[PDB]
A paper describes a structure:
Here, we investigate the capability of a deep neural network model to automate design of sequences onto protein backbones, having learned directly from crystal structure data and without any human-specified priors. To assess whether the model could perform sequence design for de novo structures, we tested our method on a Rosetta-generated four-fold symmetric de novo TIM-barrel backbone, a (βαβα)4 topology consisting of an eight-stranded barrel surrounded by eight alpha helices. We had the model fully redesign 50 four-fold symmetric sequences for the backbone and selected 8 designs for further characterization based on ranking by the model PLL and other metrics (see “Methods” section), using no information about previously confirmed sequences. Of these 8 designs, 4 are cooperatively folded proteins, as indicated by circular dichroism (CD) wavelength scans and by the presence of clear two-state transitions in thermal melt curves.
In the structure, we see that the C-terminal His tag for F2C interacts with the surface of the beta-barrel, which might also contribute to the dislodging of the C-terminal helix, although 3 of the 4 symmetric subunits are folded as expected. To elucidate this, we crystallized the protein with an N-terminal His-TEV tag ([name], 1.58 Å resolution). Since the structure is a closed toroid, the N- and C-termini are proximal, and we see that the N-terminal tag is partially resolved folded against the barrel, displacing the C-terminal helix.
Numbering used by the authors: -3 to 170
Write the structure that this text describes.
């Protein structure tokens, strides 16, 4: 939370969210991201002191509505995650700031990064337990490296490795 630029919360309920935000906010974390399938929960998280609202909606119609609800509410940093680069572009066209690439497949995921970079996406994020795959995503034009290690030791080493490589924005999921 010191070496990382962004702290990502899942917390499975609102009251956990406003508590987990308050924990991070007072003690360590700089930028706080919160993910939810509920735009109303995301609004509460932002009010509680989160910086980045990650829209988690599985269907494009719901995603566009949620991005627009958060844009009107005054959200400053809206992110959307999809396995579809078409759907990520829909979220950018609705006013999302951050496209999070989430293809199940390193070849495919790295191509989504190139396609989003070609498209002109301002901020692309990429998640991996492979620090070497995160370096390939950054060369391909990703801006945010999301560490996804299976334990604390591997997470701490991924952050160190990506700093030395030159990663400007590193995110960690608690």
């Amino acid at each position: 939370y010191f070496q990382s630029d962004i702290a990502i919360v899942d917390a499975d309920n609102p009251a956990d969210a406003i508590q987990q935000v308050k924990d991070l906010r007072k003690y360590g974390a700089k930028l706080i991201a919160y993910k939810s399938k509920s735009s109303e929960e995301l609004k509460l998280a932002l009010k509680a002191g989160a910086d980045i609202a990650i829209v988690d909606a599985d269907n494009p119609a719901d995603a566009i509505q949620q991005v627009k609800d958060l844009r009107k509410y005054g959200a400053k940093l809206i992110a959307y995650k999809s396995k579809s680069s078409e759907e990520l572009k829909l979220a950018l066209k609705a006013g999302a700031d951050i496209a999070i690439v989430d293809a199940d497949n390193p070849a495919d995921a790295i191509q989504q990064v190139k396609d989003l970079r070609k498209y002109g996406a301002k901020l692309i994020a990429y998640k991996s337990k492979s620090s070497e795959e995160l370096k390939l995503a950054l060369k391909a034009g990703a801006d945010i490296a999301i560490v996804d290690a299976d334990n604390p030791a591997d997470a701490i080493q991924q952050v160190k490795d990506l700093r030395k490589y030159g990663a400007k924005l590193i995110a960690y999921k608690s």
